[PDB]
């Protein structure tokens, strides 16, 4: 069939959090309190568009 179209390393290039899981769990509740709008937008687009390549932004 057709060739699968997936983004490149430049499109996937973002500097990440180099943060341990214990640190994330310590900051977890306030992260879910303050950063909830962007997180909910990303989760909404993830369950709306099942393709992960449509939610890189």
């Amino acid at each position: 069939p057709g060739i699968v179209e997936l983004p490149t390393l430049e499109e996937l290039k973002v500097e990440e959090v180099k943060v341990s899981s214990a640190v994330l769990k310590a900051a977890a509740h306030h992260y879910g309190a303050q950063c909830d709008k962007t997180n909910k937008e990303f989760m909404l687009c993830r369950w709306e568009e099942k393709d992960p390549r449509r939610c890189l932004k």
């Binding site: 989760m43 993830r46 369950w47 099942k50 992960p52």
Partner: protein, 63 residues
């Protein structure tokens, strides 16, 4: 009674038998065609029901 009664009774019997003959030939053709390509009421083989499919959002987003 007379010969015309037997004559017309024979006509009615022949009409009924000829109609039964053509109906049996047509139902043979109908059954053969419908079994060959099931698109009418008969020979409708089953298929799993869509009503037992979960459509709620799930844990994995890629569904």
């Amino acid at each position: 009674d007379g010969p015309e009664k037997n004559y017309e009774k024979t006509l009615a019997i022949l009409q009924i038998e000829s109609e039964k003959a053509e109906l049996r030939l047509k139902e043979q053709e109908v059954r053969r065609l419908m079994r060959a390509r099931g698109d009418g009421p008969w020979y409708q083989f089953p298929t799993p029901e869509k009503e037992f499919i979960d459509h709620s959002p799930k844990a994995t987003p890629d569904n």
